[PDB]
Design a protein around this ligand. Structure first.
Ligand code: HEM
Ligand code: HEM
Ligand code: NA
Ligand code: NA
Lengths: 717, 717
């Protein structure tokens, strides 16, 4: 190999291939963002003319362009596929992928095989982005175009929320180890898909449309359909709704040989202006289009919503055949339906075809049962598709406070993890002061208070913006029983005391000020940090924003919340079984999910350690003689050359730190020592371990604690 | 191969390995910086007691630590090597390297083989950094330790300037293509060394202490010393003075086999807490230290400044021999000087030794003349050494206005590319106003005005902070005949014209006010942009900051300014020969040298295009119908799907863009089309090409224009 210029990707990773990469802690850095610091997308899109935008998209959808002519003179089905693929990278294990960031316009997603031809589709919408400018993100426009497509063609949607914020640099995501497009090294056991992946091969959205590994067996395919769609928050009824409603529209593209399609967009020459997959087959477009290389037209009305898709699936029998590109598909037996299905550009008319994955809907017995009932009762399909599509293109939007505009339905949805509206006056400064003192008199230790508040708030992940302290869910299932939150039952004692303080405050409060359990969880930790800072000779006030509300168990989907359980939390020195990488990688990933910078992550670790936030309160990384004191001791001691460090002889992922006499003075994990070992992190430790650094450390720790407590609080932003 | 998680370094570079890497335009991002945005290092270091700091550093030098015991009970010599290596990565071709960012503490430099044992060196200074905190950067501390070491041991230095701001991530720099440490793939012909490198092997500071490629030919070694030191701005006298001055102190370390030396610090295990090359030979330290593999102690007084180096070098005859670790070195013939050279830990006392590269000082004709003199005139060595040492450790400081603290001698030095003090009062507003007019009332066009300003300001590179518009050196040699600046034409007229307006204002001016050529060259470009903005219907004012002053040709080291000649400037669509990478990479690299973000580069390219900034007024990229109007036409037209691009038949490196009627309507280079082809650049273009973007584009253009105008203006901030 050969080292390259930094402008061509050279860097320290080439000399140290498994190097912890801190650039995950500064994604989308402000210097790369072209808008001012005052720029508030939510404010711009809040003033958009939605009706005007609908007409302009309608106009685009029916004005064929010569560089990519429009099947049946309507771009709608292309745009449905576009939005579906944009939202369809979402996966539940880490909440990443999805439509929320407009990531389909950037690498690698803009060059995935499954996104072939969506480069043209995005390009067709530049007229619309052009006219609305900063009032309309690409992220919002991409999925709104699909939503408008549906309604254009006869299907009434549930609603729509604007507010997805455009970004300027692709989120770098782990999409699998396979270094070959469409490779599959992601199954073990009996067909167990590698976590966190939610697609069956590298560069597919969900499943192979020719069946598992290109074997067009509808029964087997359905197993992949069910599991990948599960991993994208869709159950049996939603998955069936989505496939049937999607393939009510449009057609597939495989007019000629695949080997005549050029490089994907990121690999194409400059002259193609970001377009890829340039084809030399015929005109290379339109009548000659090659996208997947399958050539199916599901229904006789590809630009109208109706029940044709299921009427056709069940009203013919199907035999296996080959498209012009040589791909597996199904056509109707015995020349039935010959010439019943229209051509995209006026041609002679063709006979019914379905994909292998489509037959799964009638060959798999669960799917058969659902789709047959919709054959008989189509109105039920419309309802399920509407709910499913709405969830699909909004799944990663975060709390409902983020949904903007005149198309947002008012109804509450379980999958949104709803919290109640505020129903009383919120606590002011005086009640906040009083309540902090009451928490400090309750008997709860600094350690219990800080760790409870951290447990509740750090459940937020910035990918899909699920989790967090709002909702008071730490006292509900499943959070109340997560191993990291509740090693020893200590959490229930905390919850009880905070509930008693809530009750007594609320029954005594002055005229209709009430406080939620959710707020007192966070407030309690803020109060403990004030006390520990006073124990260390600093008088500081920890900020606090009231307005969290308490969800009930019935408004908390227990199984949906399963994916938010931490398997690793370096901030609590917790490391469960099953993580993909060593502990320090996991910490970085946890910091990334909390939206933390490297300095923010660094001060929280050092503060949390000396505050006693450690899982099971064990002494790893607790490099201080003081108890519940907010000092910078963690950084001073980590830089003490009087300590010698060696892996503990027990080979247990811990380290022994000995002073000059040889006596073991400190112990620590990989997560503790990586701050003393990694040259970028140690640089940060040297800032916070200086003689002059303690006031800055308290100050920056309180700011990062405040940030983490406030992560899900879009109701005040 | 296998793709990795992003936290383990994986990303889009792996699918497309030669892609344009925009990270080079957001180095040292602000979210990674632990200090405030308000942090002001000049204000912090101003408060430092330099005497107390000197004394504290002297404590460190004479207090030996057990984990790296001090040769001769004095760490001074080790710190001088540390300082010399900190500064010894600098190179004139791009000005990268140097001590000015403290980059020795980060990867890759912290782990170069030539930087072995300096991990221990930097570690020993932590007690100092701990005490001074944010008032003293590591970057300052590392070279100031070397300087203090010199003074400590009886050498009076010329001075020292503080002011190097610490950074938080490695500056990523192309150090060569060899993927092997010490590997050699950088030579062609008879010892022609690959540009832009200044070292003979990968991970060496300058040359191989055993002679080229381990061939201990002192005559041939001097060839590489002369060439490597010249590429770090040192001539023959400075180079001989540096080596003699350095090797007056300390020793090398090669007490046993190097296969007993463990991994370099970026590879070493967590428990080593940032240190590396852990060694199982003997105690692995002190008596048993192994650093380079050589074992030479040059003088009989390793902790004292005197003339022993050259007296030994010349007073003995030298024969080849092998260090305990199999390294080539020289020793005294005839057993002369037995037992005369003292042991660093009380051992018996040894014979004289020299490196092969030391012998070059006596073998090479040119060095031998210089050093023969110093054998009888140590006062001249001492003088040249102080001058050269001072220049080595300040080469990348930028303008003199930046040198901070009480140890800066006022004497002007030519290598600092000096500019005169402000002789008179400075043009005020009313004055500034009137002179825009006289310049608009000249026959100077927006094209020549804007282009001449840019030509001057854009000579600044942020690597070593040389260059820029202060000094008015555009009218001097060499800038005035740089192929890019005046392809044989308009320059001299703009120069001649602007000088005339200098008199007309000066020969008649209000009181003590005068104005420099340098300040007009900039203000010219400025008022032009006010004109081109008017022609586009926006009334705006471009900021301008007076204060520049004219240097003489006599104050302009013509050769020193040669390395500042653009072989490439995408902002003027100029692409000379010799460039190591295709045009679009040269574009990003030039924007990095100008400290520009990606949004800044984008607005600047679009804006200058439509002002005629182009080399030879070429039509490439000038996507506008307007003459000297400042619109966003470049962006709008770039995104025009009505245009079709293909490479010019000519194989020019140009492209034609045809309208529907097959007519060429635009032409462009790689640099122009990359803004429409690269997925991240095109995102920026779509911000500025939108309907509502004209005011914002002008604003950001001016703000970015201001920034490039002010790059060298450290005298005002
Ligand atoms: C089993 C999962 C699915 C598979 C395997 C699948 C596969 C495909 C394939 C291969 C194409 C043809 C691509 C081409 O060459 O042009 C296609 C087209 C399409 N799919 Fe899917 N699909 C799935 C689910 C969905 C879903 C959930 C939707 C949306 C609700 C959807 C909507 C569409 C649409 C609209 C097209 C038509 C594009 C056009 O008219 O140009 N599909 N699908
Ligand atoms: C041709 C140029 C040079 C070569 C080939 C060279 C080579 C070396 C080598 C191989 C070592 C051994 C390090 C070890 O094993 O501990 C060393 C040490 C040293 N170098 Fe040089 N060097 C050069 C220039 C300089 C310069 C320009 C300076 C200062 C201005 C300098 C100052 C020192 C000092 C003080 C030591 C002793 C450090 C100690 O006592 O640990 N060297 N040099
Ligand atoms: Na239909
Ligand atoms: Na000496």
């Amino acid at each position: 190999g050969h080292m390259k210029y930094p402008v061509e990707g050279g860097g320290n990773q080439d000399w140290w291939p498994n190097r912890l990469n801190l650039k995950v802690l500064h994604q989308n850095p402000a210097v790369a963002d072209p808008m001012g610091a005052a720029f508030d997308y939510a404010a711009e899109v809040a003033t958009i003319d939605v009706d005007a935008l609908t007409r302009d998209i309608e106009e685009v959808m029916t004005t064929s362009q010569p560089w990519w002519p429009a099947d049946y003179g309507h771009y709608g089905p292309l745009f449905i596929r576009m939005a579906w693929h944009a939202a369809g990278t979402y996966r539940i294990h880490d909440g990443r992928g999805g439509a929320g960031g407009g990531m389909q316009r950037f690498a690698p997603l803009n060059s995935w095989p499954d996104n072939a031809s969506l480069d043209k589709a995005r390009r067709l919408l530049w007229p619309v982005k052009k006219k609305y400018g900063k009032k309309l993100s690409w992220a919002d426009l991409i999925v709104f175009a699909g939503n408008c497509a549906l309604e254009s063609m006869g299907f009434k949607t549930f609603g729509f929320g604007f507010g997805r914020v455009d970004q300027w640099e692709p989120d770098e995501v782990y999409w699998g180890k396979e270094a070959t497009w469409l490779g599959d090294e992601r199954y073990s056991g009996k067909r167990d898909l590698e976590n966190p992946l939610a697609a069956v091969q590298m560069g597919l959205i969900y499943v192979n449309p020719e069946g598992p590994n290109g074997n067009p067996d509808p029964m087997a395919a359905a197993v992949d359909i069910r599991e990948t769609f599960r991993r994208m928050a869709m159950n049996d009824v939603e998955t069936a709704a989505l496939i049937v409603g999607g393939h009510t529209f449009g057609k597939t593209h495989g007019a000629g040989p695949a080997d005549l399609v050029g490089p994907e967009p990121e690999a194409a020459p400059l002259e193609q202006m970001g377009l890829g997959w340039k084809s030399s087959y015929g005109t290379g477009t339109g009548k000659d289009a090659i996208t997947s290389g399958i050539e199916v037209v599901w229904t006789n009305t590809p630009t109208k919503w109706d029940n044709s898709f299921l009427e056709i699936l069940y009203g013919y029998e199907w035999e296996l055949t080959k498209s012009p590109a040589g791909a597996w598909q199904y056509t109707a037996k015995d020349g039935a339906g010959a010439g019943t299905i229209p051509d995209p550009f006026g041609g002679p008319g063709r006979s019914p075809t379905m994909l292998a994955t489509d037959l799964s809907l009638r060959v798999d017995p669960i799917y058969e049962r659902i789709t047959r009932r919709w054959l008989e009762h189509p109105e039920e399909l419309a309802d399920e598709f509407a709910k499913a599509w709405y969830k699909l293109i909004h799944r990663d939007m975060g709390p409902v406070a983020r949904y903007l505009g005149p198309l947002v339905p008012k109804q509450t949805l379980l999958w949104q993890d709803p919290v109640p509206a505020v129903s009383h006056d919120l606590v002011g400064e005086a009640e906040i002061a009083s309540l902090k003192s009451q928490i400090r008199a309750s008997g709860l230790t600094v350690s219990q208070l800080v760790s409870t508040a951290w447990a509740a708030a750090s459940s937020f992940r910035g990918s899909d913006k699920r989790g967090g302290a709002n909702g008071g869910r730490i006292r509900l299932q499943p959070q109340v029983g997560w191993e990291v939150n509740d090693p020893d039952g200590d959490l229930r004692k905390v919850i009880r005391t905070l509930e008693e303080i809530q009750e007594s405050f609320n029954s005594a409060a002055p005229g209709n000020i009430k406080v939620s359990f959710a707020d007192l969880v966070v407030l309690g930790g803020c109060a403990a940090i004030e006390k520990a800072a006073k124990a260390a000779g600093h008088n500081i006030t920890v900020p606090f924003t009231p307005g969290r509300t308490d969800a009930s168990q019935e408004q908390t989907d227990v199984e949906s919340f399963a994916v938010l359980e931490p398997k690793a939390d370096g901030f609590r020195n917790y490391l469960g079984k099953g993580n993909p990488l060593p502990a320090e990688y996991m910490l970085l990933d946890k910091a990334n999910l909390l939206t933390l910078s490297a300095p923010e992550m660094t001060v929280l670790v050092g503060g949390l350690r000396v505050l006693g936030a450690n899982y099971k309160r064990l002494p790893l990384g607790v490099f201080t003689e003081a108890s519940e004191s907010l000092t910078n001791d963690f950084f001073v001691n980590l830089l003490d050359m009087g300590i010698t460090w060696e892996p503990s002889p027990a080979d247990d992922g811990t380290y022994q730190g000995k002073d000059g006499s040889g006596k073991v003075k400190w112990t620590g994990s990989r997560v503790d020592l990586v701050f003393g070992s990694n040259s970028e992190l140690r640089a940060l430790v040297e800032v916070y371990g200086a003689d002059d650094a303690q006031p800055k450390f308290v100050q920056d720790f309180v700011a990062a604690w405040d940030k983490v407590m406030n992560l899900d609080r879009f109701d005040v932003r």
